[PDB]
């Protein structure tokens, strides 16, 4: 009634994965040699990146609080070496999730 519910959230995530893995395999290759490759990291759908730039995508629409973050973006940085950035002492690549997080009481 008030909650989106675990079932509806996970079900909405499955559809976001379904649309993502569709695009990932049917979207035409970039044909520009060097670029960061498209991916689905469990949280978001990333496209092919342009080297030496920041790549952004909307907050994933399956989020419970998606309505509360509609101008939000999640970010990656595609290096000149055609590789998604990965910082000192890490395995999961650099990502700014900030604009997409929840935030507590007020209005």
């Amino acid at each position: 009634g008030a909650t989106v519910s675990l079932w509806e959230t996970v079900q909405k995530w499955r559809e976001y994965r379904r649309q993502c893995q569709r695009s990932l395999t049917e979207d035409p290759p970039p044909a520009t040699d060097l670029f960061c490759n498209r991916t689905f990291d469990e949280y978001a759908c990333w496209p092919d990146g342009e080297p030496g730039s920041f790549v952004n995508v909307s907050c994933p629409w399956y989020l419970p609080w998606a309505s509360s973050v509609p101008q939000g973006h999640v970010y990656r940085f595609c290096t000149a070496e055609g590789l998604w950035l990965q910082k000192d002492n890490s395995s999961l690549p650099w990502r700014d999730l900030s604009e997409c997080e929840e935030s507590k009481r007020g209005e």
Binding site: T3, V4, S5, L6, T9, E42, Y43, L63, P64, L92
Partner: protein
């Protein structure tokens, strides 16, 4: 209030798990 407040809590727990890497994280799925 308790059953409907635990499912909104599970969805925060699920998004957090996804944020960590989902299956790839090594942490078990929340609920």
């Amino acid at each position: 209030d308790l059953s409907k407040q635990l499912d909104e809590q599970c969805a925060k727990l699920f998004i957090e798990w996804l944020a960590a890497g989902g299956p790839s994280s090594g942490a078990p799925p929340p609920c």
